[PDB]
Amino acid sequence: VRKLKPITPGQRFRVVNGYDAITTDKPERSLISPIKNSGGRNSQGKMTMRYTGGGHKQRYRIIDFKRTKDGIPATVKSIEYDPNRTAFIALLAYADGEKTYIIAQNGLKVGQKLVSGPESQPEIGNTLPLSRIPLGTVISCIELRPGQGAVIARSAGTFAQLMARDGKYATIKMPSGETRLILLTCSATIGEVSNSDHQLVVSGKAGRTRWLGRRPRTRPVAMNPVDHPMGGGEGRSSGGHPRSRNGLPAKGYRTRSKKNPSNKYIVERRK
RNA sequence: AAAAUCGUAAGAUGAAGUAUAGGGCCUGACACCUGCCCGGUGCUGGAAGGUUAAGAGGAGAUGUUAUCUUCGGAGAAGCAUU
């Protein structure tokens, strides 16, 4: 994490990530798939999910979220940067000959030989089921369904914690502060996710927002009453109660269905 | 199987992403700060008490008449309205 000197007004308060954990710059050719970006336009062509434009076309790296090769140790070969996510990748090479692109942890260096499966040790990098992760560990990449992949705690710097174990389910504290139950057969990876220094990055420039793929956002307050329910008015005016576009209140109104069939797994809300 | 957005649906964006992520709204680098009011209108939680829809339920009442009643009238069963 570097702090650029105030040479230019577009560089005064800019803070650049250090990328100190990255080793290799060239990716692996056999584990890359083509990907194109959309400006929010859906299949038919209508622009849904506005404010996303486009910039600096990227390539997709096939990340291995299942990690269903139990008993085969794999060595870390390189720690690389992925533009399609927030955390580093740290390519792995298995003992039999395969090469995968699992997501990296906080203390994963180049040279570590980590093993998967249930008979492994609770060390950083190793993946174990929740029936064998001992207790209160800072885990990540928690599976929500057995054999599907990684869902929870996948961004840079996140982690969860084990709480208890009752027969079939284990209580887990999601990064948001929500306490929820997850099957014991689900897998998870010990150790926090990488980067962890992403929240400290400042742009100091309107151009970086567009390098990342965003577009400027107009406030409905500076609009006409035909465009948004909050526009109009001689002079500078407010918009009454903030609505979204269809009269939906935008302050306190909860949008979670009170008849959600997955309500039998939530212990606290914190969202 | 996220919220949200387009459609009658199937489907699609969000996202081959996942809370250091994605939406809604206000202000607009930086320095010092950002006081009081929950009466009114919005939002969240509660639900002891009052009011309250459709749908169930059918006390009783009405119409007709087998029959009995010197006239008046009463009237079982069935069938319908309320």
Layout of helices and strands:
Layout: E1 2-3, E2 15-16, E3 32-33, E4 60-61, E5 74-78, E6 91-94, E7 99-100, E8 113-114, E9 127-129, E10 138-140, E11 160-166, E12 169-173, E13 179-183, E14 187-190, H1 206-211
Antiparallel strand pairs: 1-2, 3-4, 5-6, 5-8, 6-7, 9-14, 10-11, 10-14, 11-12, 12-13
The protein binds one RNA strand of 82 nucleotides through loops.
PDB class: ribosome
Keywords: Translation Initiation, Protein synthesis, bS21, ribosome
Entry title: 70S ribosome Flavobacterium johnsoniae
- What oligomeric arrangement do these chains adopt? part of a larger assembly
Shape: globular
Widest beta sheet: strand line-up: 9-14-10-11-12-13
User: What percent of the residues sit in helical stretches (DSSP H or I)?
Assistant: under 10%
Strand tally, please? 14
Could you spell the SSE succession in H and E letters? Answer: EEEEEEEEEEEEEEH
PDB class: ribosome
Keywords: Protein synthesis, ribosome
Entry title: 70S ribosome Flavobacterium johnsoniae
Name: 50S ribosomal protein L2
Compact description:
By secondary structure, this protein is an all-beta fold. The chain has one helix and 14 strands; from the N terminus they run ββββββββββββββα.
Describe this structure in words.
The chain is mainly beta. It has one helix and 14 strands. The chain is globular, with a radius of gyration of 22 Å. Strands 9-14-10-11-12-13 form a six-stranded antiparallel β-sheet, with no helix packed on it. It binds one RNA strand of 82 nucleotides through loops. The PDB classes it as ribosome. Keywords: Translation Initiation, Protein synthesis, bS21, ribosome. The entry is titled "70S ribosome Flavobacterium johnsoniae".
